[PDB]
Amino acid sequence: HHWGYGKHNGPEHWHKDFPIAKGERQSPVDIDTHTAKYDPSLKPLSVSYDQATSLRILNNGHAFNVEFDDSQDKAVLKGGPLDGTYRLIQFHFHWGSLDGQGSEHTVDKKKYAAELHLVHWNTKYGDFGKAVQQPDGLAVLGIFLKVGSAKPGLQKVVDVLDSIKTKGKSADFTNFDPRGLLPESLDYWTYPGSLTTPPLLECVTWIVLKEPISVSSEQVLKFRKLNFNGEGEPEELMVDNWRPAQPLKNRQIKASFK
Ligand SMILES: [Zn+2]
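Above: inputs. Below: predicted complex with zinc ion.
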């Protein structure tokens, strides 16, 4: 009875194995633009993916992750509200059963078709495993996906999904430049949060971009062909793998714009 997104093992059941699910710094959250606070002291975000080195893409039964080589000071996230440097280790998405839903964070209750999470760990801590044990261990860049024109930089991902349909499958995924998944503007909202999947550790400084990237209906449709199940097991399409908004509980969401 492993955790999942079904009615029997979904978000509403997670607290039984991970009590922190009802904690004080849980993610995602709804971004109420009227209550968010513009902070003029917030510096521009610094995303350096020029030399990021992608390795493989795999279906872990919850989503698909594109992993990178984080052994060198390659892809790093810094600046913005951060006081340290974080290395990119992997990215994945969360999406729905229809274009009307799929994102984890919402803006004034609005849900996007999907949400991209670029995960980075603090260089003060040695590696990912050690970083998640600290309150400022991770910096996750969240980017909303809306339907419209195609996103060229996403095509390589879309095209390879048919080869890793079921849990446990993976494929070579070298030479992928994540710079192709970023919107033009880097304006953002930021707040202290957690991982949105178990163990739900409250070790994340969330940075959610104001500008969503546009992907075509054809592209997002491909996400919905994946399976939660492994090969040979009953079909369980991978859709609605998103955790709903959690109580802000007085944390303050700051923005780099009004
Ligand atoms: Zn995520």
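Residues 1-258 form a domain with the Carbonic Anhydrase II fold (CATH 3.10.200.10).
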